Ligand binder design. Sequence first.
Ligand code: NA
Length: 129
Amino acid sequence: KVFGRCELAAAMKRHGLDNYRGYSLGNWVCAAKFESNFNTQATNRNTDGSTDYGILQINSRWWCNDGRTPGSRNLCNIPCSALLSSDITASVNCAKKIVSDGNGMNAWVAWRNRCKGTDVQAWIRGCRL
Ligand code: NA
């Protein structure tokens, strides 16, 4: 599914991301925009052979199982395919684990490089929430 901007803001709010670990909703929407362009089915293969999945491009080296990332973990205890669903539950629940892991949203390099420190509230401007 490709979400609209406000549609995703609303869904992420329903799923408990607004101010999760202190990160306002616009931070999450901004991250999703630059990770996946709001496409739940986004995948990208990394140089190390791992793959990133879903709206927040969660990586198979640590977080999900895809069966083809040698030496990896599955800390979210999910198949990576779950991260591609139109239902964002798996992506959100895993993101909550990731952002609690120590470096906060810096885990998402696109967030650090494109969202961190910016006027992220613009991502939720004009949305019914
Ligand atoms: Na894995």
